[PDB]
Paper text:
Using single-particle cryo-EM, we determined the structure of [name] at 3.56 Å resolution as a monomer. [name] contains 11 transmembrane helices (TMs), TM0-TM10. Similar to OSCA, the ion-passing pore of [name] is surrounded by TM3-7. Three bulky pore-facing residues (F542, F543 and Y546 on TM6), highly conserved among TMEM63 and OSCA, have been proposed to play critical roles in channel activities. Particularly, the short α-helix located at the cytoplasmic side of TM6 (TM6b) swung to TM4 to avoid the clash with TM0, the intracellular half of which moved close to TM6, compared to that in OSCA. The movement of TM6b may narrow the ion-passing pore of [name] for calcium entrance. Additionally, we identified two non-protein densities within our cryo-EM map of [name], which are likely composed of lipids, and may contribute to the modulation of mechanosensitive ion channels gating.
TMEM63s, together with its plant orthologues OSCAs, are members of a newly identified OSCA/TMEM63 cation channel family that are activated by mechanical forces of osmolality. TMEM63 has three members, TMEM63A, B and C in most animals including mouse and human.
Author numbering: 26 to 714
Write the structure that this text describes.
């Protein structure tokens, strides 16, 4: 009696397909670097060529560089010189490239690679052999009796599975503790002499009033400076437009001085028509039009700056001489909502010190003057709305990855006629889900930019949190909660009716009747996605951006100024934590996803090390991102414990004593995760001053 269950799974077919994809993409890179010239290195050289003083250039001492950049970017030239004779690294190859941020990257990366290695010893040599010996399924089936389906209900081995899950959450906590023991994070919150104050009445146009209030409230306190904020979004836009016009004017002036006047067409649709008729599009001088537009933009910028003084916001900045009085101000002002009246002065009635909420002012570079205007308590209701919209869109978008698995026949009594083709049944949903996961962070970034929150530190934290949470949701739970579909509803009434069916039917998990979908996804995602990451996936973004506004030839030089894209650590941690979460979720269940998880980790390291040294422009990382990424890493096995609880309740029962360890660990695991989190904040507090 055979109706479903794919023998040997889709693993071999997707394996040959992804190795073909990998060799194809590596050949495509090589041919792009050999035929499209220095596409991926000239932009990097231009970006680091003193961008602070790139528009204007002066001949200084030793103008010709001493091959500092040439020495590094001259090793990988041959086609075969990409893998061997290239690392010689032994934990010291690239420490002095990006700073301490790159140092913590692989610090955690390895605390992962060796972590998944120490997982590959018992999860391949203990749980896999004892799950293979299960015989509740059919012997003839392969990859169906190697997963958690094969362990029988009436057996003392699901206890081993759950206990192993608990001890593996413990060992992951130990690994992350070893990682945290060597964080020694840089003190990002330097003792700032300037504070940020909100809700300040706009009628106090004199900073002397605020200075007098601070002096009277705090004896012995000196106010260095007082700063006020203004609506400068239009000012910023006008400045950007003027900068673009000025750069284009210089480019066209140089072109005119070199090869004479150049005639261009201002209309964007001129390039669309190949018509050479004079009446179709009027031709105007490039430099004259550029100068006129720049003059008009400068006049509008001057008018906006003149009107800026009238648009005073309620956010102010006060600078003090000593940070001790700043700490006193913060300690007095943090608990205002608790009913304590802070220190007052003679002009406090105008000041209204009971309204002010003062915290440590972020760095001005971290401060974006355009998006500090995003502050209201009409918040947290748009957030639920945008979150619901994104969740519904992602559900309706990932539904095809589930419905492509079709539905069994159950109509005629002769299933010998034909069966499903493994290619589109297994590889296609996997690659399609991979494409959706790859395109997800773009939409997540767009949503976060729409929200814009309060400060960019919180913005990056909410990115690295919400992108990860949506990804693990869409990749673990609802792809399986909706994969409980194809439910057997026929002569066999409930799940365990032996009426006209063998033990192949298992309502607990019958996703492709074995669970091969997720391992198929992880292997294809590994190989294809890191083939894309070798080509960096940012090339498609650049292509789309140029196709959006392909015009105004000096804009090509403008693009080349910022053609080199820096590291987007949010996306890379999103990928790593997504696959880590899915592996930890199905590690104990199906142990075949473990060695392929090792393959993903090792090959991801292989690609991003080369990216680090030759395609990832160095740039510092905020410590909060890593301090949250470790928290996601430790919280990931709660997904696996939740899946173990799910399998206890469905397959085993409710009051069965095992359902309770999964029931208990999930409780002990969450309480221990909270303990570890608040211990991490406590250690930060210790290593804060």
């Amino acid at each position: 009696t055979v109706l479903q269950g794919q023998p040997f799974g889709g693993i071999p077919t997707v394996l040959v397909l992804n190795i073909i994809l990998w060799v194809f993409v590596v050949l495509l890179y090589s041919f792009l670097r050999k035929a499209a010239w220095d596409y991926g290195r000239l932009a990097l050289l231009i970006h680091n060529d003193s961008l602070t003083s790139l528009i204007y250039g002066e001949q200084s001492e030793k103008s010709s560089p001493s091959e500092v950049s040439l020495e590094a970017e001259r090793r990988d030239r041959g086609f075969s010189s990409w893998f061997f004779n290239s690392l010689t690294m032994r934990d010291r190859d690239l420490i002095n490239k990006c700073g301490d941020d790159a140092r913590i990257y692989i610090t955690f990366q390895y605390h992962l690679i060796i972590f998944v290695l120490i997982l590959c010893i018992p999860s391949l040599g203990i749980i896999l052999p004892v799950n293979y010996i299960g015989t509740v399924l059919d012997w003839n089936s392969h990859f169906g009796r190697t997963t958690i389906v094969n362990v029988s209900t009436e057996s003392k081995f699901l206890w081993l599975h759950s206990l192993f899950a608990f001890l593996y959450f413990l060992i992951n906590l130990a690994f992350m503790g070893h990682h945290c023991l060597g964080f020694v994070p840089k003190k990002s919150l330097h003792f700032t002499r300037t504070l940020m104050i909100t809700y300040v009445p706009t009628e106090i146009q004199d900073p002397e009033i605020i200075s007098k209030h601070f002096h009277e409230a705090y004896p012995g306190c000196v106010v260095t400076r007082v700063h006020f904020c203004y609506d400068v979004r239009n000012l910023i836009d006008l400045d950007d437009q003027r900068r673009h016009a000025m750069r284009g004017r210089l480019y066209y002036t140089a072109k005119a001085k070199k090869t004479g006047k150049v005639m261009i067409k201002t209309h964007p649709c001129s390039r669309l028509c190949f018509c050479k008729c004079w009446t179709c599009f009027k031709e105007v001088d490039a430099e004259q039009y550029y100068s006129e537009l720049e003059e008009q933009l400068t006049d509008e910028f001057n008018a906006e700056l003149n009107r800026v003084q009238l648009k005073r916001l309620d956010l102010i900045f006060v600078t003090f001489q000593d940070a001790r009085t700043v700490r006193r101000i913060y300690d007095d002002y943090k608990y205002i909502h608790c009913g304590r009246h802070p220190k007052q002065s003679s002009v406090t009635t105008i000041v209204k010190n009971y309204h002010w909420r003062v915290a440590h002012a972020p760095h001005p570079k971290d401060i974006i003057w355009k998006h500090l205007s995003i502050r209201r308590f009409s918040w947290w209701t748009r957030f639920i709305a945008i979150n619901t919209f994104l969740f519904f869109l992602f559900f309706f978008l990932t539904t095809p990855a589930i419905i492509i698995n079709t539905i069994d026949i159950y109509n005629v009594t002769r299933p010998i006629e034909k069966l499903q083709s493994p290619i589109v049944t297994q590889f296609f949903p996997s690659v399609l889900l991979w494409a959706f996961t790859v395109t997800m962070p773009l939409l997540v970034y767009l949503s976060a930019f729409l929200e814009a929150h309060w400060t960019r530190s919180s913005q990056n934290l909410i990115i690295v949190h919400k992108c990860y949470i949506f990804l693990v949701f869409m990749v673990v739970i609802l792809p399986s909660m909706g994969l409980t579909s194809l439910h057997v509803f026929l002569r066999w009434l409930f799940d365990i009716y032996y009426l006209e069916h063998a033990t192949i039917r298992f309502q607990c998990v019958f996703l492709p009747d074995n669970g091969a979908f997720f391992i198929n996804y992880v292997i294809t995602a590994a190989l294809l996605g890191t083939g894309m990451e070798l080509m960096r996936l940012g090339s498609l973004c650049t292509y789309c951006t140029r196709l959006f506004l392909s015009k105004s030839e000096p804009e090509r030089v403008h693009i080349r100024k910022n053609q080199a894209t820096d590291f987007q650590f949010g996306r890379e941690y999103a990928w790593m934590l997504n696959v880590f979460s899915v592996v930890m979720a199905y590690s104990i269940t199906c142990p075949i996803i473990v060695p392929f998880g090792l393959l993903y980790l090792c090959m991801k390291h292989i690609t991003d090390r080369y990216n680090m040294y030759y395609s990832y422009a160095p740039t510092k990382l905020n410590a909060q991102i890593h301090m949250a990424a470790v928290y996601q890493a430790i919280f990931a096995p709660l997904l696996g414990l939740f899946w173990m609880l799910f399998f206890s309740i469905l397959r085993v029962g409710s009051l069965h004593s095992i359902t309770l360890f999964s029931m208990s660990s999930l409780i002990i695991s969450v309480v221990i995760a909270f303990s570890g989190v608040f211990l991490g904040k406590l250690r930060i507090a210790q290593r804060y001053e």
